[PDB]
Write a protein that binds this ligand. Structure first.
Ligand SMILES: *[C@@H]1O[C@H](CO)[C@@H](O[C@@H]2O[C@H](CO)[C@@H](O)[C@H](O)[C@H]2NC(C)=O)[C@H](O)[C@H]1NC(C)=O
Ligand SMILES: *[C@@H]1O[C@H](CO)[C@@H](O[C@@H]2O[C@H](CO)[C@@H](O)[C@H](O)[C@H]2NC(C)=O)[C@H](O)[C@H]1NC(C)=O
Ligand SMILES: [Cu+2]
Ligand SMILES: [Cu+2]
Ligand SMILES: [Cu+2]
Ligand SMILES: [Cu+2]
Length: 533
């Protein structure tokens, strides 16, 4: 299909790397004496010159950038992140991949208005993995994320550094955040407002930049792919520009929830919205060559229904030097980790159908706006349940996301006989792609925290109109652990608060060292994550 956005100078701008986000300070947790890292992020509009010869684009992002800055937090270190809304529409921050308490999880209605902020208390006790934080405000999640509110959150673990994977953020360990946008004739963004089917986009970006290039050395690199697009799913392959007909093999080492048990040799990677895979690619064998990262055509080989345009088959280019500066010491071990799978169950799976009810995208016929019916499941905390995710259509696909949990992919049947479970789906995941006429079964441990949580399709257009629902991970009233103040996402205790801009810029008032200290220490005393010990 003919490209609609104006022509871009392909592969002329180097791949940008989002800067590491540093904490402002640390507060000592009164309960155990340990340091909690405290950060401040300001949500605000900014201008970005995307087409060198046209006008600029109007974005809104964390700290005035897109992607937002990258967090790097070691397991065991609790963090508190104060997201300050200084924009012109409401926000709700969701750290995807983290078992946060309900009121810190970005519940769609748990909104912060302009002129307010909300403090998020993150546990960071889970396995090393690439998380990402992004907006979740009800009915406007698509435009908010699209205009720039998304960013990386790397949970790290020293035992994992002992594997000696390629390393160094921005050196040999490179984030690859894919988006897919559309631009107007004067180089501004085309809004998603009005789109009720899917917003495909015809200009592919990596890390905020359309069709970038990167100079690389002939050695191993670790790539952290994240499909951050509104609606576009990808089929990823590498190919020499001289032989685009031939796929260069590589290794997948991680999925949503962390490392696989063993590296999976792949030459084609399906990745859908909200999905994260880490890949090690070996440029050794291609010294002097240019490698193109490409995108499978025909709506991802017939798995999807995405529209393909003139240039959406291309992602970026890697120009490989003749030699390395220093010798590649890194390795990709055959054994990565023991994957902590849920204790298996064979209780009949709970069925969910993702489809259409009139003009609305629904889950078992309900829309999220329907407060009285959106709570589709009660699961006692500590329970393992299989869920059967069903897409009976050929006209839509749905990457399904379940909050709180990590899950194992049990099976996939395609009505088009297209595929089953992939080798890179061998580990633990929190989003799984239901392609054309696929039903997938997943197995998750609903643990270890009680609360009301979302689950939905991560096609943001579908999500907003209105393919989202809720589940309750329940406990008995004698459970304790302050469950009473942590189960309801709208719990007033944790709601947003107004601030004055002078206070924020002067780092005084609610933003003074002492006030931040007292507030965090008080949150801490509630001991929200103690059940994870
Ligand atoms: C989700 O489950 C929680 C925990 O089981 C429910 O909270 C209980 O609700 C009853 C009736 O209001 C109270 O007597 C209990 O004290 C509550 N328990 C706790 C731990 O607070 C909660 O109502 C459910 N949420 C929704 C929206 O249904
Ligand atoms: C549940 O929350 C309350 C309030 O955060 C905790 O009680 C506070 O504990 C601190 C220090 O441990 C005391 O100085 C306060 O006086 C307590 N406040 C109240 C209202 O009791 C309590 O320990 C938490 N309990 C659990 C089981 O996590
Ligand atoms: Cu998400
Ligand atoms: Cu999530
Ligand atoms: Cu969908
Ligand atoms: Cu969500």
């Amino acid at each position: 299909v003919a490209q609609i956005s104006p022509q871009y100078p392909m592969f002329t701008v180097p791949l940008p790397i989002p800067p590491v986000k540093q904490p402002r300070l640390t507060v000592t947790n009164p309960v155990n004496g340990q340091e909690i890292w405290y950060y401040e992020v300001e949500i605000k509009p900014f201008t970005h010159q995307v087409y060198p010869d046209l006008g600029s684009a109007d974005l809104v992002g964390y700290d005035g950038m897109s992607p937002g800055p990258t967090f790097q937090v070691p397991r065991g270190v609790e963090t508190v992140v104060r997201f300050i809304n200084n924009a012109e529409a409401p926000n709700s921050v969701h750290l995807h991949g983290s078992f946060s308490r309900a009121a810190f999880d970005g519940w769609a209605e748990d909104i912060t208005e302009p002129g307010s902020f909300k403090d998020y208390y993150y546990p960071n006790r889970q396995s090393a993995r690439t998380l990402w934080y992004h907006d979740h405000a009800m009915h406007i999640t698509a435009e908010n994320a699209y205009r720039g509110q998304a960013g990386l959150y790397m949970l790290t673990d020293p035992a994992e550094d002992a594997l000696n994977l390629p390393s160094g953020y921005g050196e040999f360990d490179i984030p690859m955040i894919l988006t897919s946008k559309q631009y107007t004739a004067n180089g501004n963004l085309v809004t998603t407002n009005g789109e009720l089917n899917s917003f495909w986009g015809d200009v592919i970006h990596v890390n905020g930049q359309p069709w970038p290039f990167k100079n690389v050395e002939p050695r191993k690199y670790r790539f952290r792919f994240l499909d951050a697009a509104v609606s576009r799913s990808f089929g990823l392959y590498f190919a020499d520009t001289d032989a685009i007909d031939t796929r260069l093999p590589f290794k997948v080492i991680a999925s949503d929830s962390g490392l696989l048990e063993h590296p999976a040799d792949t030459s084609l990677l399906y990745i859908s919205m909200a999905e994260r895979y880490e890949v090690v690619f070996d440029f050794s064998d291609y010294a002097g060559k240019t490698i193109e990262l490409r995108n499978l055509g025909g709506s991802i080989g017939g798995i999807g229904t995405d529209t393909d345009y003139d240039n959406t088959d291309k992602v970026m280019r890697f120009v490989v030097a003749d030699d390395t500066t220093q010798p590649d010491t890194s390795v990709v071990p055959a054994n990565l980790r023991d994957v902590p799978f849920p204790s298996p169950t064979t209780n009949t799976p709970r069925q969910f159908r993702f489809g259409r009810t009139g003009p609305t995208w629904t889950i078992n016929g309900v829309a999220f706006a329907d407060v009285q019916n959106r709570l589709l499941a009660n699961v006692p905390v500590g329970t393992v349940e299989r869920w059967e995710l069903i897409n009976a259509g050929n006209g839509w696909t749905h990457p399904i996301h379940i909050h709180l949990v990590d899950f194992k992919v049990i099976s996939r049947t395609s009505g088009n006989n297209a595929r089953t479970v992939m080798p890179y789906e061998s580990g633990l995941k929190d989003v799984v792609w239901l392609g054309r006429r696929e039903t997938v079964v997943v197995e998750a441990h609903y643990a270890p925290f009680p609360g009301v949580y979302m689950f939905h399709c991560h096609n943001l257009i579908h999500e907003d109109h209105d393919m989202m629902a809720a589940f309750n991970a329940t406990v008995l009233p004698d459970y304790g652990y302050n469950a009473t103040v942590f189960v309801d996402p709208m719990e007033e205790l944790w709601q947003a608060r107004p601030y004055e801009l002078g206070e924020f810029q002067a780092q005084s008032g609610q933003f003074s060292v002492q006030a931040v200290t007292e507030r965090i220490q008080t949150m801490a005393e509630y001991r929200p994550y103690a059940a994870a010990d």
